[PDB]
Amino acid sequence: AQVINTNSLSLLTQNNLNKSQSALGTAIERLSSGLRINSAKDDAAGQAI
Amino acid sequence: LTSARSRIEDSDYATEVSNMSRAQILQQAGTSVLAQANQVPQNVLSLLR
């Protein structure tokens, strides 16, 4: 209950913050560029094509 | 290069804020406990009035 030294719940929260941040960054980059494919990371074979 | 350097240098505010909170509570609770600890031998004196 009164956990010691470790607020496990806060740790758990941090991960969801990370996930949302990653999605937002992707969306902003795509929105700015005007391209769904800013690098081979987005869509490799499609990038080549 | 800017991104790469940042991942080495910068601090994540969430992590350090959480650490700060942990340390704050630890300090407060510990000081109260210490007060009681010092009062202990004074209770032994309470045997010895």
Next chain:
Amino acid sequence: STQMMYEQNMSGITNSQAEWMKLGEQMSTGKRVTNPSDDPIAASQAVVLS
């Protein structure tokens, strides 16, 4: 004879106060256990986990 109550009482007092010292250790330090003498199994697993 005479001493008996005092010997019983000092025994009880020492048990209680030793336990209190340990408890304060347990609150102050911020962890269930310090030494392998206490829960050696947990100590080994904590090392392995580290």
Next chain:
Amino acid sequence: KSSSLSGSLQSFFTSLQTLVSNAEDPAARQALIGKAEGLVNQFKTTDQYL
């Protein structure tokens, strides 16, 4: 655990790994030597007081 070697040993290896990715970096080499020398003290400390 701070009164124990395990902290240094695992830090030693963590440093070692980092060399395995920057083989041409003198600074990482120096840090590895530093970990090693710090670890020499600890072992000789425990032996010394044994």
